[PDB]
């Protein structure tokens, strides 16, 4: 029983974390088969231009200008490349602890586990979600650049995020490991807007189903309605519109305890006009929106990763 | 920048998790140098859970009885003993993944990270705390016994918990690695409700400081309160008594933020009677008591002006 905010076991990712230094800038890097992946802004943030020119900053650099350190033993760089935001340092030594991995880009509403690293040493692991404004509300300090977010599929660390910079709002932005930034962001230091953040309704519905799996119903009432009878309600309460594809993926959770996904929406509506404040909703008062339907199944079924 | 419920990297613990099977019961085990630590009750039988005589059952079992698997490879047991609640299984193969470790018994209110495992493979990692009633609020399904809780100090895993049972109220009970339960619990079939969960005051005070170092200062403290009269209101609100030792550990956060320990106590009273009315302390509407002062300093490492 119980329901916590779980994160994936980070063991397979801890063995890939190295330290990348170019000049005086030092951040983290991901050591896959024989390539080290790190944000490209390790090559130009020592002279503090506020607008680095990464196209010409890399041509001058040679292989010996970089310094990849795998904890203790130094790594030889035998080639460098840049894929639109990230630096690929070709290394001579293949990482023996490379797991099965794949690069995948996530959509807003998806969740992943972040491994905060400093100087190549992992410090903590936490689970977060990709907000609709293409930002993440994580916990990063200076020197955490290069930290990655990931999921696991039976052995397969699907990397989906790499931390690049922090927005003035306090939220954090980054790219996928192909390089493309999540949202309209640039790796330069110019001030950029965070965007409009909306609570994820599809994750809220899944979270409410997790309460009735371990068992706390406490709100199921008031005249089950249809899809469009809740989209306009979400507009007023800052929540995002609910699509039918969200209902489609809410099937298994509805096909376990509840009657229909439509029934869950009606009870959620009263949770907006009214507040609990006397009995927590299985973890707290405020509604949590960082639990995808796929995360609830994983935690309630005890899925492991070998 | 940012504050989240992070857990320690579970990489070093995953390398110590094995699967222990005793005839018909299967749970997890902690594979240290040449001893596999798993909860006793693995040798017990469903028909004999009324009042198991573990000493009598341990004699009936031999080394060939215990089936220890480190993934796909079997470990041969060459001895079996019992530290009154755990089953030390002497094995022939020394674990090469053993990190520097030590068995520590934590006090109520201290936090640790839990690596939930099933059939010897990890499922997820999350952060929780030992509640004052000597129970934890975790997420465990059947077969999670043997999952351990731990902390890391820069090179060393401090094992402090091993999961044994789930109480009927939804909370979980376990032992230290030396085989001693936290609280009035035994591995039998008696009721064991464990009673009256209490809120941790030293942790919530630290959590209130975390909001200060992240852009939340609207819980202004006007007056102050001494050590005793603070406990006058902390007995009816069901809060852990605050001691001068708790003030000493809160010293570094008091100096870093400039708010005195006694001053912050008076700030809590405004949030109690008046409620929220839309007030969210940086992460939720309710108070969080699973952040020790050490966790706050660890995560948002500020500076102290003196």
Numbering used by the authors:
A (entry chain A), B (entry chain C): 1 to 306
What does the paper say about this structure?
The SARS-CoV-2 main protease (Mpro), a cysteine protease with essential functions in viral replication, has been validated as an effective drug target. Mpro is a cysteine protease that contains a catalytic dyad consisting of the nucleophilic cysteine 145 (C145) and histidine 41 (H41). It proteolytically processes the viral polyproteins pp1a and pp1ab at no less than 11 cleavage sites, and thereby also ensures its own release. In this work, we demonstrate that the SARS-CoV-2 Mpro is subject to redox regulation in vitro and contains multiple redox switches including a disulfide-dithiol switch between the catalytic residue C145 and C117, as well as a SONOS switch of residues C22, C44 and K61.
Specifically, an allosteric SONOS bridge consisting of two cysteines (C22, C44) and one lysine (K61) within one protein chain was detected by our mining of the protein data base and independent structural studies of Liu and coworkers. C44 is close in sequence to catalytic residue H41 and located on a flexible loop (residues 44-53). It points either towards the active site and contacts Y54 (“in” conformation) or towards the protein surface (“out” conformation). Variant C44S exhibits the lowest residual activity (16%), while variant C117S is slightly more active (42% residual activity). The markedly reduced activity of variant C44S comes not unexpected as residue C44 is very close to catalytic residue H41. A full kinetic Michealis-Menten analysis indicates that the reduction in activity of variant C44S is due to a decreased catalytic constant (kcat) rather than impaired substrate binding. Interestingly, variant Y54F, in which the tyrosine that interacts with SONOS residue C44 is replaced, shows a similar catalytic deficiency (19%) as variant C44S suggesting that both residues are required for full catalytic competence of the active site. To define the structural basis of the markedly reduced enzymatic activity in variants C44S and Y54F, we crystallized both variants and compared the atomic structure with the known structure of the wild-type enzyme (X-ray statistics in Supplementary Table 1). In the case of variant C44S, we were able to obtain a structural snapshot of the covalent acyl intermediate formed with the C-terminal glutamine of a symmetry-related Mpro molecule as previously reported for wild-type Mpro. This structural analysis reveals in both cases small structural changes mostly confined to the active site, notably of residue H41 that forms the catalytic dyad with C145. The structural changes for K61A are clearly more pronounced than observed for variants C44S (0.89/0.91 Å) and Y54F (0.24 Å), highlighting the structural importance of K61.
